[PDB]
Amino acid sequence: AGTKLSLMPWFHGKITREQAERLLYPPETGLFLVRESTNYPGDYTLCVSSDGKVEHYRIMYHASKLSIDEEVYFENLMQLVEHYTSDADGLCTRLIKPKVME
């Protein structure tokens, strides 16, 4: 049993920035994961490989709504990933391929 988010192949839970860097190597544009900081529950960073390195997009919450750009907002993290899977909408790349959680 788990939450929907817990079962999402791109969701790695509480891993560090440095551990994400090792998971997203070698670079492959559009390979991605989301990790959570131990600082605070639901403090997420979307980590995506693009143009030979990892880009890190930290989620913010504004009145409980999630964004990574202060332009486009979502109710939850799964909606955010869904959106950027289909088009870049200003990100460095679409989220093309999950780095599958093991």
Author numbering: 73 to 174
Quote the study on this structure:
Csk and Chk both contain SH3, SH2, and kinase domains, which are separated by the SH3–SH2 and SH2-kinase linkers. The Csk SH2 domain is crucial in stabilizing the kinase domain in the active conformation.
Crystal structures of both oxidized SH2 and C122S SH2 were solved and refined. All of the three forms of L-SH2 without disulfide bond were greatly destabilized compared with L-SH2 containing disulfide bonds with free energy value reductions ranging from 12.8 to 15.9 kJ/mol. X-ray crystallography data were also consistent with the NMR observation, in which most of the changes in chemical shift took place in the residues close to C122, and this area was likely to undergo greater structural change than in the C164 residue area. Although the side chain direction of C122S residue was slightly different, the overall backbone position was nearly identical to that of the oxidized form and superimposes on the structures of Cα atoms that display a root-mean-square deviation of 0.19 Å.
